[PDB]
């Protein structure tokens, strides 16, 4: 029907003077039952957009979906991405994961992953996975595939999902001791995921506030502006957008490039998210941030945005700082952040010969 | 359907005068004492509202207590439950030894049964392997499949009511609370009110029991309560309090109003900053929704639809009985 494309078009034609309203427009929409969060609400699109499969000829298949994993103090919200999440994509299945058996998580008869094709498994309830059931995961999380030769059968069968996971911080939380020791946790496993955000509550005299008065008073979407968005419009985004097929560029790869082996040795290069498998997510993060907003040319500006973000990711050693999920809003400005971040990342690690070139771009604009 | 007998005695109970001691203390009348842990049963059994806001998407939030009862033995702390189970439209009683994880949850488990009810459950100490499977019943209001969790989910709207004993027997009154219960701080913060009873011998207490069983077989909101011996308080039949909660519970739906919200947001700004700073039970955003929930339940019973001062001076009385009045 070329009412729903002709819909989109003029929607994504209005904004074109500011390119960063559409996209906080659609961010606004997500989850709008919890007030601010801006990077929590950020990453989940990133994750849900996808990515894009490559396989070589003979025998090799490399993966193409994201994961994500959110850690936090009791009475954040974590529960309510999972369940609203659940709802958007097509066909998902939600699962309990303590309460769930071996016969759901692997093959037995379909369980869970098997069932989930070309849809999004959430977990909840990560901590004590049942070691066995939590470990026989990991040649299903990275090859997209299943290889068992239970009971002499010789039984192969294919499982791309994407897996949504929240986990309680066992043991008081310290900002040091970093999430191998939290959770305790194995390296092997703590590899495989792209984002680990942290979620962290503190001391503050306006958040508490706000938060009781939004509550309080029962206003329903404090934007009383008719804008919104309605659930069925963002399923018919998030199941349209699934189809085109971005291509890389010039002005593009080397900034990834050059930020991978900067961050691969600056004095620590952490203990497990310095393997190779940060360039293979770098460049799956990259290609999804160019499927929301209409496009299919990687450019300058979707790879900064992805730099900040996955810097961000790094809670604790990093090479710019740290902040904290909780404590964000939205900015009233887009367009002035995005001129200001470009112009502190491309400064110490040196491309200025592109940053003449994008300010003058953006002039003329 | 209710008769119209029916109609007019509901209407005749509603015009007494003190409609509220005439059902704290009609719950149960052999045991002496204990008057703000039955007040506790009583707003459990009303129950609060369901708030679907946000049609489009809802993700409906519940709007039904939960309480907990620890203490030393021999108070008598399993015949308070034993009445609450019995006044109500739809009740169910199970102990804590004789029942496994496929018992409580599907596999039609309890919880199934005492849908719009209770499911009180005795013995809650003794359960060291099932703890970990409630949790998502109480909060998400739903359970699924127990195979493989594919799909094929139930509704489980249950309004749980647990009674449990201390680790080492009598509890002593030199440790910390967190060790004398043996609860992580997840099962701990679901919990809308964790009462906590002490024996201690005292002596005109002591005179009045002895007296009381003896003759058995032959101003703050804790005297207004209490009877004051010279007068009689003569009790509604169990049979005629069944047939009161269900005509409340389906022909009124509570809201608040403008000046009750405030006295709540003082409460809760003041726990805050000073429960930040010193040992306690963290105060997450869901203690907020809670003195809403019982705020709302505190005008159910009466039978109205509003939220005055001093229905909201109510839940500020009996919530500090769990919460700072006895963390010291
Ligand atoms: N920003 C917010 N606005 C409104 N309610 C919130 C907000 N953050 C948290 N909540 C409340 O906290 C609850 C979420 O609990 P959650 O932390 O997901 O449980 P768990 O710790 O088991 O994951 C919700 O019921 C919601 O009402
Ligand atoms: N205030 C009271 N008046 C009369 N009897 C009481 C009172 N308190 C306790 N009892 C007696 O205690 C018994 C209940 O024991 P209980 O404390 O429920 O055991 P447990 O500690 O294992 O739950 C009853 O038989 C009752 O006669
Ligand atoms: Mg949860
Ligand atoms: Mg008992």
Same mark, same amino acid.
């Given at each position: 029907?070329?009412?729903?494309?002709?819909?989109?078009?003029?929607?994504?034609?209005?904004?074109? *003077?500011?390119?960063?309203?559409?996209?906080?427009?659609?961010?606004?929409?997500?989850?709008?039952?919890?007030?601010?969060?801006?990077?929590?609400?950020?990453?989940?699109?990133?994750?849900?957009?996808?990515?894009?499969?490559?396989?070589?000829?003979?025998?090799?298949?490399?993966?193409?979906?994201?994961?994500?994993?959110?850690?936090?103090?009791?009475?954040?919200?974590?529960?309510?991405?999972?369940?609203?999440?659940?709802?958007?994509?097509?066909?998902?299945?939600?699962?309990?994961?303590?309460?769930?058996?071996?016969?759901?998580?692997?093959?037995? !008869?379909?369980?869970?992953?098997?069932?989930?094709?070309?849809?999004?498994?959430?977990?909840?309830?990560?901590?004590?996975?049942?070691?066995?059931?939590? %470990?026989?995961?990991?040649?299903?999380?990275?090859?997209?595939?299943?290889?068992?030769?239970?009971?002499?059968?010789?039984?192969?069968?294919?499982?791309?999902?994407?897996?949504?996971?929240?986990?309680?911080?066992?043991?008081?939380?310290?900002?040091?001791?970093?999430?191998?020791?939290?959770?305790?946790?194995?390296?092997?496993?703590?590899?495989?995921?792209?984002?680990?955000?942290?979620?962290?509550?503190?001391?503050?005299?306006?958040?508490?506030?706000?938060?009781?008065?939004?509550?309080?008073?029962?206003?329903?979407?404090?934007?009383?502006? /008719?804008?919104?968005?309605?659930?069925?419009?963002?399923?018919?985004?998030?199941?349209?957008? &699934?189809?085109?097929?971005?291509?890389?560029?010039?002005?593009?790869?080397?900034?990834?490039?050059?930020?991978?082996?900067?961050?691969?040795?600056?004095?620590?290069?952490?203990?497990?998210?310095?393997?190779? &498998?940060?360039?293979?997510?770098?460049?799956?993060?990259?290609?999804?941030?160019?499927?929301?907003?209409?496009?299919?040319?990687?450019?300058?500006?979707?790879?900064?945005?992805?730099?900040?973000?996955?810097?961000?990711?790094?809670?604790?050693?990093?090479?710019?700082?740290?902040?904290?999920?909780?404590?964000?809003?939205?900015?009233?400005?887009?367009?002035?952040?995005?001129?200001?971040?470009?112009?502190?990342?491309?400064?110490?690690?040196?491309?200025?010969?592109?940053?003449?070139?994008?300010?003058?771009?953006?002039?003329?604009? | 359907?209710?008769?119209?007998?029916? +109609?007019?005695? =509901?209407?005749? =109970?509603?015009? /007494?005068?003190?409609?509220?001691?005439?059902?704290?203390?009609?719950?149960?009348?052999?045991?002496?004492?204990?008057?703000?842990?039955? #007040?506790?049963?009583?707003?459990?059994?009303?129950?609060?509202?369901?708030?679907?806001?946000?049609?489009?998407?809802?993700?409906?939030?519940?709007?039904?207590?939960?309480?907990?009862? @620890?203490?030393?033995?021999?108070?008598?702390?399993?015949?308070?439950?034993?009445?609450?189970?019995?006044?109500?439209?739809?009740?169910?009683?199970?102990?804590?030894?004789?029942?496994?994880?496929?018992?409580?949850?599907?596999?039609?488990?309890?919880?199934?049964?005492?849908?719009?009810?209770?499911?009180?459950?005795?013995?809650?100490?003794?359960?060291?392997?099932?703890?970990?499977?409630?949790?998502?019943?109480?909060?998400?209001?739903?359970?699924? +499949?127990?195979?493989?969790?594919?799909?094929?989910?139930?509704?489980?709207?249950?309004?749980?009511?647990?009674?449990?004993?201390? @680790?080492?027997?009598?509890?002593?009154?030199?440790?910390?609370?967190?060790?004398?219960?043996?609860?992580?701080?997840?099962?701990?913060?679901?919990?809308?009110? @964790?009462?906590?009873?002490?024996?201690?011998?005292?002596?005109?207490?002591?005179?009045?029991?002895?007296?009381?069983?003896? #003759?058995?077989?032959?101003?703050?909101?804790?005297?207004?309560?209490?009877?004051?011996?010279? !007068?009689? =308080?003569?009790?509604?039949?169990?049979?005629?309090?069944?047939?009161?909660?269900?005509?409340?519970?389906?022909?009124?739906?509570? &809201?608040?109003?403008?000046?009750?919200?405030?006295?709540?947001?003082?409460?809760?700004?003041?726990?805050?900053?000073?429960?930040?700073?010193?040992? *306690?039970?963290?105060?997450?955003?869901?203690?907020?929704?809670?003195?809403?929930?019982? %705020?709302?339940?505190?005008?159910?019973?009466?039978?109205? /639809?509003?939220?005055?001062?001093?229905?909201?001076?109510?839940?500020? /009385? =009996?919530?500090?009985?769990?919460?700072?009045?006895?963390?010291?």
């Amino acid at each position: 029907d070329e009412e729903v494309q002709k819909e989109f078009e003029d929607f994504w034609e209005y904004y074109k *003077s500011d390119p960063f309203a559409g996209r906080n427009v659609i961010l606004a929409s997500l989850c709008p039952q919890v007030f601010g969060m801006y990077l929590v609400k950020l990453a989940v699109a990133m994750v849900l957009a996808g990515g894009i499969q490559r396989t070589d000829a003979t025998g090799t298949r490399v993966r193409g979906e994201s994961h994500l994993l959110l850690v936090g103090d009791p009475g954040t919200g974590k529960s309510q991405f999972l369940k609203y999440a659940a709802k958007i994509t097509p066909r998902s299945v939600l699962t309990t994961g303590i309460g769930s058996t071996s016969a759901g998580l692997t093959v037995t !008869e379909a369980g869970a992953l098997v069932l989930a094709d070309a849809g999004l498994c959430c977990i909840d309830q990560f901590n004590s996975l049942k070691e066995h059931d939590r %470990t026989s995961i990991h040649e299903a999380m990275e090859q997209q595939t299943i290889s068992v030769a239970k009971a002499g059968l010789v039984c192969k069968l294919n499982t791309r999902t994407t897996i949504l996971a929240a986990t309680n911080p066992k043991g008081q939380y310290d900002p040091q001791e970093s999430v191998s020791v939290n959770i305790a946790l194995g390296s092997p496993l703590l590899s495989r995921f792209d984002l680990i955000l942290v979620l962290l509550d503190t001391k503050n005299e306006d958040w508490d506030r706000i938060i009781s008065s939004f509550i309080l008073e029962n206003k329903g979407y404090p934007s009383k502006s /008719e804008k919104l968005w309605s659930m069925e419009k963002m399923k018919t985004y998030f199941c349209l957008i &699934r189809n085109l097929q971005p291509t890389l560029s010039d002005v593009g790869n080397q900034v990834l490039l050059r930020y991978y082996q900067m961050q691969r040795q600056s004095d620590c290069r952490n203990a497990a998210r310095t393997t190779i &498998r940060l360039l293979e997510s770098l460049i799956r993060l990259a290609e999804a941030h160019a499927r929301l907003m209409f496009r299919d040319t990687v450019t300058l500006e979707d790879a900064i945005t992805v730099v900040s973000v996955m810097e961000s990711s790094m809670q604790g050693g990093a090479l710019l700082g740290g902040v904290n999920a909780l404590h964000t809003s939205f900015p009233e400005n887009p367009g002035e952040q995005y001129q200001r971040q470009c112009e502190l990342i491309l400064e110490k690690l040196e491309l200025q010969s592109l940053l003449s070139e994008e300010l003058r771009r953006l002039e003329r604009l | 359907e209710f008769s119209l007998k029916d +109609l007019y005695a =509901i209407q005749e =109970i509603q015009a /007494e005068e003190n409609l509220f001691k005439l059902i704290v203390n009609s719950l149960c009348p052999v045991i002496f004492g204990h008057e703000l842990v039955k #007040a506790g049963l009583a707003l459990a059994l009303f129950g609060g509202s369901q708030k679907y806001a946000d049609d489009k998407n809802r993700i409906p939030i519940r709007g039904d207590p939960h309480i907990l009862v @620890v203490g030393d033995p021999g108070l008598g702390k399993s015949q308070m439950l034993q009445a609450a189970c019995n006044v109500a439209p739809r009740g169910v009683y199970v102990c804590g030894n004789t029942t496994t994880t496929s018992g409580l949850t599907v596999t039609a488990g309890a919880l199934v049964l005492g849908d719009q009810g209770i499911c009180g459950i005795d013995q809650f100490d003794k359960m060291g392997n099932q703890h970990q499977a409630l949790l998502e019943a109480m909060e998400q209001q739903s359970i699924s +499949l127990a195979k493989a969790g594919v799909v094929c989910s139930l509704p489980a709207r249950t309004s749980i009511i647990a009674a449990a004993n201390p @680790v080492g027997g009598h509890y002593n009154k030199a440790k910390t609370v967190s060790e004398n219960l043996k609860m992580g701080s997840a099962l701990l913060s679901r919990f809308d009110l @964790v009462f906590i009873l002490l024996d201690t011998p005292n002596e005109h207490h002591d005179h009045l029991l002895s007296e009381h069983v003896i #003759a058995i077989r032959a101003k703050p909101l804790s005297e207004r309560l209490k009877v004051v011996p010279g !007068e009689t =308080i003569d009790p509604i039949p169990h049979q005629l309090l069944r047939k009161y909660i269900g005509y409340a519970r389906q022909y009124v739906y509570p &809201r608040l109003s403008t000046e009750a919200a405030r006295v709540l947001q003082d409460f809760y700004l003041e726990l805050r900053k000073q429960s930040q700073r010193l040992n *306690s039970s963290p105060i997450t955003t869901r203690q907020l929704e809670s003195l809403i929930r019982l %705020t709302e339940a505190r005008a159910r019973l009466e039978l109205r /639809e509003e939220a005055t001062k001093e229905d909201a001076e109510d839940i500020v /009385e =009996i919530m500090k009985y769990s919460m700072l009045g006895t963390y010291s």
